Write a protein that binds this ligand. Structure first.
Ligand SMILES: *[C@@H]1O[C@H](CO)[C@@H](O[C@@H]2O[C@H](CO)[C@@H](O[C@@H]3O[C@H](CO)[C@@H](O)[C@H](O)[C@@H]3O)[C@H](O)[C@H]2NC(C)=O)[C@H](O)[C@H]1NC(C)=O
Ligand SMILES: *[C@@H]1O[C@H](CO)[C@@H](O[C@@H]2O[C@H](CO)[C@@H](O[C@@H]3O[C@H](CO)[C@@H](O)[C@H](O)[C@@H]3O)[C@H](O)[C@H]2NC(C)=O)[C@H](O)[C@H]1NC(C)=O
Ligand SMILES: *[C@@H]1O[C@H](CO)[C@@H](O[C@@H]2O[C@H](CO)[C@@H](O[C@@H]3O[C@H](CO)[C@@H](O)[C@H](O)[C@@H]3O)[C@H](O)[C@H]2NC(C)=O)[C@H](O)[C@H]1NC(C)=O
Ligand SMILES: *[C@@H]1O[C@H](CO)[C@@H](O[C@@H]2O[C@H](CO)[C@@H](O)[C@H](O)[C@H]2NC(C)=O)[C@H](O)[C@H]1NC(C)=O
Ligand SMILES: *[C@@H]1O[C@H](CO)[C@@H](O[C@@H]2O[C@H](CO)[C@@H](O)[C@H](O)[C@H]2NC(C)=O)[C@H](O)[C@H]1NC(C)=O
Ligand SMILES: *[C@@H]1O[C@H](CO)[C@@H](O[C@@H]2O[C@H](CO)[C@@H](O)[C@H](O)[C@H]2NC(C)=O)[C@H](O)[C@H]1NC(C)=O
Ligand SMILES: O=C(c1ccc(Cl)cc1Cl)N1CCO[C@@H](c2ccccc2)C1
Ligand SMILES: O=C(c1ccc(Cl)cc1Cl)N1CCO[C@@H](c2ccccc2)C1
Ligand SMILES: O=C(c1ccc(Cl)cc1Cl)N1CCO[C@@H](c2ccccc2)C1
Ligand SMILES: *[C@@H]1O[C@H](CO)[C@@H](O)[C@H](O)[C@H]1NC(C)=O
Ligand SMILES: *[C@@H]1O[C@H](CO)[C@@H](O)[C@H](O)[C@H]1NC(C)=O
Ligand SMILES: *[C@@H]1O[C@H](CO)[C@@H](O)[C@H](O)[C@H]1NC(C)=O
Ligand SMILES: *[C@@H]1O[C@H](CO)[C@@H](O)[C@H](O)[C@H]1NC(C)=O
Ligand SMILES: *[C@@H]1O[C@H](CO)[C@@H](O)[C@H](O)[C@H]1NC(C)=O
Ligand SMILES: *[C@@H]1O[C@H](CO)[C@@H](O)[C@H](O)[C@H]1NC(C)=O
Lengths: 322, 171, 322, 171, 322, 171
């Protein structure tokens, strides 16, 4: 009579690597590296993202007419920009602190688009019909939906001084613009004042703008420029504009709400009726594995991104079924 | 292996033992058969489950981490952010791969140790009532029925019960 | 006769964790994680810290009257600010490069407060009695101790041009201010010049300041603003001020010395007659352990901060006393 | 254990052996008693002291590290500094916990190895002059006084001195 | 007859450290820490570096006369500055965004120095012979090789407006300067206009410069200042200068090419006829080891820098030849 | 050692065995001599070569990494860049030294394990035809010529061929 001591073997072809040996066939193992995604843009914990479509951050906040208008009140879990965002800043100019504005929006979870300065009520004795061809819509010349080009009325540009008190209970993002004609003749024809100025003041913001006239190369068939500025009016604070020309006045501001875990991503995938706890620009990840080699840009509760192509931990024995 | 049992003096594994990682194969007049050792198998399962769960837990939940944008006059800050991201990625890839390799080596050595410990336990139970015919097997110097095989498998082998017969057959 | 081989056991209840097993009772172990502190602010290597009390960095450097005046010459190992620092910038305005100034002070180990421009000697034909209610002291209106509000004297504000040569052998922090009235009437009443300017020049610093007049929301019952600027005059260099109005002139500058291992912390603990090699906002650490889970902000020679709740390394055996 | 001695064929520990980690318990006509093995105990103490000191030394002195402040128009730089701090903290917590776990496992295995090595040394010294009665014990086939026990404990056991008596009693 | 089982031993004195023991003599080992270098500056993958000699980045780009002129077209793998770069900004002033310019040059692999505005063709009715003693050469007063000091001609400084179209197919670094006299008398004597201005515009760049007059401390025996500005004209874009005084006009621009793996280092070693894949400020590294304790600043394919003094991995056994 | 062979019951090494890490020394009427065991030596060489190559490969190629410059009003950014560089350097020095120490310990234990496994294989081959005279040696109970020594060294020892003579000499 005999008795033997042995160990398990099966038809497992799983291979793991050790420090002393590579490609060790084992009976049981566990994959720690997640490489699978659905290739879709899904909701993040029940909240759909904010898709800007043809627009980017600048074009959406300024109100580019070429982009489909969004609902007045929106809420999202993350922002999505398309790689070929052709509609953004339509009139040539510089967006001051645009990256800081994107970083601020990265923690925003909701906006309410309201009329801070009504068009036919806020700027008397001034023309509010100024449009341009660089911001065309349906072939015709147009202008931003959230801004208003104030020009001379009846050969006179009286000094305007308006203000808004923030009674929304939240931060109010306010955007405006400063125009710079290429020559002084256009300056007189548009604002009737060669020594014009703009002043924007709050309780913590204070800036003065002076037009700078010079011939500039044609960008979008425009020799003049238009610098865009923004600020975050705190709850209860008052913002005051005072100008005698060159002021691209605000018309629609944004009532913002702060959140956590949000961010801005550039994705090419489409939105589907799905939900996930982890979103990448390539697709959603439904996994509890610790690692993933899909994309370094992650939104939500995701595995740690690594460059590895294989992360498998052996749980069984050395498979020797011979 | 590090303990010389798996792929050592026990050359291969048993596909016929599907109930556990370690066990026995017996042969007597009543017949032959496999039987997994549930104690060592369960202890190894507990240890390896704890190891895997520990490796998974030590990696915290990766929350939202996106890229940032910089204008044409902020190249230094852009390169600094890129250096931070690349260094963190290098460090984490290094840690993950190294930990996986180390734990794989240690798990193989752990299975080897368990097999060797089971063999040595059976050997110290049997003493000179059986001879080591190699390949991790013992040939009894006495008749060992299913009751005797079960007393061997659960650690209650009666040495004086078969000592006289084993001494007679050993001559 | 028999002899046995065995191992040690005791009444130790210490538990450690392994990769294969948790909560292993062992005979001997060593704690590597320091979780104990004294809850006091102590000296750091024999040098007491600099406690600003009711003031912050801005209020202390500008000379807010609401804070108890410090000794003329001081030396410290680290700076402490209270969480509820109500006394800082008392006249509404912007502190330009204030965070960079804090970062510069983070490596400063000593200061000597000296009179760079005497009050009754530096600014002839100008009034030096300007005070405000936003910087009140003992109920009465007052002003910064280190600055001087120059106004019109006898209906005329002559162009002042003063300078200081640094013969202190060290860096000299010099602070000044620029006032911005809300209207031009107050501008004429205070400085008699509508086109005023300020100029501050050194060998490496050069800046010009122009007043910007506009009605602004009331902050501390003040519609005007006061922007604060600073510079570090190098040893041997000369600083020159040239102004015809709106200049909040310097009166006391700081002779600074550079050191190592210092920093600025926000703490709620009190100063005690004690000494340590490691200081946290929660208390001092007297330990040689490699890790600590007390606070990530550390001053001096401290253990590495970790989020762990337990870091115990086994030195003995598996305790089996049965 | 990894070597099957601690919590293995030697079931429990000895509270009566206070002088060291490993040792012996003897019993003869002159009486019984414990005695720690100072050589293996001292070598283990040296090794584990070196291990602990190494783990402590590899962590350099954490010098002054405080937070920084940023104005409302420097949110990107603030988030970059926060990301740097959080990544370093994650990495260091991970390293500390992982190293502690690995070294604890290795220390337990080291004690197991020391116990097994001591037992095997005693066994190879005794040879067939004593029988393995399990539980890490040996029953002599001859009279072994305190001098013989001391010659066993320090590695100078005289096999031919008791070979004849052990063969007679072994029969 | 006897047979024994044993292990190898030799006369090896190699020592390694373990977790349980230090200074373990072993039979075989491998050194992973590279500590050897040749102490020379070599080519990097067949391309010689760009040595600025007596100049730094600023002095080389502006065209300091004290430095030997380089070839019109150059290509390099990395830039080398000497620690004692005495020739840089020779006329006292501020180099705006100089560090960002260095960071931009860090990815440049080639330059072509061409004449963007010829001296005797671009600025009619203006004097182009302005020199200074702060930028002396061979004892005589001189000026930058790449800039031109435009002054008044025949008692009149007509408004100049010039432009350059980039048809080089690559980025064009253009540098210019703005002069600030200490008094208005010199302003009238040099530019005949007290209210002068400069304007530099491209398709993405737009800046206006106004002279600021004030008495300043003597730096290099000069009371005036000269601020230096730069821009990167994109291929196909046009740069336009428009000034009526104080314009230090450009004369030579740089046609730049982008590359990878380059950088700027400060070294004291000399250039030798050698080639390497790894370059440090102390010397070149010819090694395949993973680590090195030579220098943290590396160019090319280098080992990872560590502070360690010894990194030796045992491959053999514990050497016991007794 | 962890397995008690190197610097254990085999006290020292053999300088006369230059052909490998592990082997044998035989002595019979035909003479004496060393002979390295090529199988275990080659397997150890493969394993340690893989270990060294793995440690070298896990460290990626360090590409260009130079310092940056900052003006007098960018002290926070300068300190942030310095903190990033110093933290990465600390982490990498820590990882390198720790990995070297761990792998050195594991390599010593691996050699110990290989030596012990070779000894146990020879012992299980010889059985009672030879006696363990300690120091990792076996004294045969029969005449073992060069052919018998070679059959011992390559794992084809014929036990019944010398069983009768070994039993006669063992008496
Ligand atoms: C990792 O290990 C596995 C298993 O050892 C390797 O897979 C095997 O690769 C060998 C080639 O080296 C295959 O062998 C060939 O098989 C055919 C079958 O008809 C036979 O005709 C040839 O003469 C030759 O023997 C083998 O089939 C294959 N087995 C499996 C299950 O895939 C694998 O290649 C290793 N990977 C690496 C990267 O080393
Ligand atoms: C880590 O291990 C220790 C020791 O094994 C655990 O402590 C023990 O916990 C058990 C409960 O699981 C306690 O048992 C109870 O004891 C009372 C005593 O009268 C008895 O009446 C109950 O029937 C039950 O057996 C045990 O006393 C306690 N011992 C000590 C020394 O604390 C500990 O809970 C473990 N921790 C974790 C997190 O697993
Ligand atoms: C690491 O280990 C090596 C080898 O054990 C150490 O080297 C040795 O150091 C000892 C001193 O502790 C030297 O001993 C002296 O040797 C002279 C030779 O004439 C003798 O006269 C003295 O009485 C004493 O024994 C020994 O020669 C030397 N051997 C070699 C090969 O260097 C080394 O010091 C150790 N390093 C550390 C940091 O511990
Ligand atoms: C180990 O196996 C043996 C069988 O060989 C068990 O022993 C017998 O137990 C059954 C049921 O309790 C009795 O009917 C027999 O009379 C027993 N035989 C002898 C010879 O005692 C034993 O109980 C098992 N041990 C454990 C812990 O399960
Ligand atoms: C190990 O223990 C033995 C005791 O059994 C020691 O031997 C004896 O040593 C004493 C004192 O040196 C003598 O008086 C006895 O005559 C010795 N007895 C025999 C039988 O020789 C031995 O010295 C110890 N070994 C070591 C290294 O300490
Ligand atoms: C192991 O060594 C033995 C020598 O002891 C080898 O056996 C002999 O092989 C030679 C050549 O093949 C023959 O001429 C002898 O007649 C053999 N002797 C016996 C007793 O059979 C054996 O081949 C070796 N094994 C391996 C795998 O190389
Ligand atoms: O490998 C595993 C495993 C997988 C994942 C984890 Cl987290 C832990 C473990 Cl232990 N197993 C789980 C239990 O079953 C074992 C088995 C052994 C022999 C025969 C059949 C099944 C195999
Ligand atoms: O655990 C330790 C220890 C603690 C800290 C360090 Cl840094 C190193 C070590 Cl080795 N010990 C120190 C020596 O005494 C040992 C002992 C063993 C058995 C009985 C009584 C005491 C126990
Ligand atoms: O240590 C090594 C070694 C070095 C570097 C690497 Cl990457 C791998 C290894 Cl294995 N050796 C290489 C083969 O030869 C071995 C030897 C053993 C005994 C006697 C003479 C030579 C010794
Ligand atoms: C492999 O094993 C699995 C599980 O027992 C079984 O379902 C499958 O049919 C097997 N395949 C082969 C080819 O053996
Ligand atoms: C996600 O994966 C789990 C298993 O990991 C599965 O049960 C579930 O259906 C998947 N989908 C969703 C939406 O959870
Ligand atoms: C535990 O052991 C210590 C040290 O020997 C002793 O002082 C203490 O009294 C013991 N306590 C108990 C409850 O055994
Ligand atoms: C600090 O701790 C040590 C022991 O770690 C102790 O001796 C000392 O009294 C404590 N206090 C001071 C001020 O050192
Ligand atoms: C050491 O060994 C090497 C290699 O065998 C040999 O060349 C050298 O002469 C030896 N030196 C001594 C002093 O033994
Ligand atoms: C560099 O080192 C290698 C060996 O590592 C050597 O063959 C070569 O000659 C050295 N020099 C060059 C220029 O490669």
């Amino acid at each position: 009579d005999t008795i033997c001591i042995g160990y398990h073997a099966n038809n497992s072809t799983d291979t793991v690597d050790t420090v002393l040996e590579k490609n060790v066939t084992v009976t049981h193992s566990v994959n720690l590296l997640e490489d699978s995604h659905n290739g879709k843009l899904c909701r993040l914990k029940g909240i759909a993202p904010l898709q800007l479509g043809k627009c980017n951050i600048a074009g959406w906040l300024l109100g580019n007419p070429e982009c489909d208008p969004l609902l007045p009140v929106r809420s999202w879990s993350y922002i999505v920009e398309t790689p070929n965002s052709e509609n953004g800043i339509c009139y040539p100019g510089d967006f001051i602190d645009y990256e800081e504005l994107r970083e601020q929006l990265s923690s925003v979870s909701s906006f309410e688009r309201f009329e801070i300065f009504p068009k036919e009520s806020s700027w008397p004795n001034h023309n509010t019909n100024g449009v341009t061809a660089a911001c065309s819509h349906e072939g015709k010349s147009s202008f931003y939906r959230n801004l208003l080009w104030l020009t001379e009325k009846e050969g006179s540009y009286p000094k305007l001084k308006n203000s808004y008190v923030n009674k929304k209970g939240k931060e109010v993002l306010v955007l405006w613009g400063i125009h710079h004609p290429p020559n002084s003749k256009e300056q007189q024809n548009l604002y009737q004042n060669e020594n014009a100025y703009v002043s924007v003041v709050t309780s913590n913001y204070n800036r003065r703008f002076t037009p700078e006239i010079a011939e500039r190369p044609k960008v979008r068939d425009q020799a003049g420029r238009m610098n865009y500025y923004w600020t975050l009016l705190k709850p209860g604070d008052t913002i005051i504009f005072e100008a005698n020309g060159n002021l691209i006045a605000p018309m629609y501001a944004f009532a913002l709400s702060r959140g956590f875990g949000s961010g801005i991503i550039t994705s090419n995938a489409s939105m589907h009726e799905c939900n996930t706890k982890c979103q990448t620009p390539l697709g959603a990840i439904n996994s509890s594995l610790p690692y993933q080699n899909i994309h370094p840009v992650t939104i939500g509760e995701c595995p740690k991104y690594v460059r590895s192509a294989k992360l498998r931990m052996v749980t069984g024995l050395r498979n020797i079924p011979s | 292996g590090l303990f010389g049992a798996i792929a050592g003096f026990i050359e291969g594994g048993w596909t016929g033992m599907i109930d556990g990682w370690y066990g026995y194969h017996h042969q007597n007049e009543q017949g032959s058969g496999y039987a997994a050792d549930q104690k060592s198998t369960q202890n190894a399962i507990n240890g390896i489950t704890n190891k895997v769960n520990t490796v998974i837990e030590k990696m915290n939940i990766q929350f939202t981490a996106v890229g940032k944008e910089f204008n044409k006059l902020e190249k230094r800050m852009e390169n600094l952010n890129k250096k931070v991201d690349d260094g963190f990625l290098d460090i984490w890839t290094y840690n993950a791969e190294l930990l996986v390799l180390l734990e794989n080596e240690r798990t193989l050595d752990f299975h080897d140790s368990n097999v060797k410990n089971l063999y040595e336990k059976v050997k110290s139970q049997l003493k000179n009532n059986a001879k080591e015919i190699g390949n991790g097997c013992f040939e009894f110097y006495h008749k060992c029925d299913n009751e005797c095989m079960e007393s061997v498998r659960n650690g209650t082998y009666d040495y004086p019960k078969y000592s006289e017969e084993s001494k007679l057959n050993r001559e």
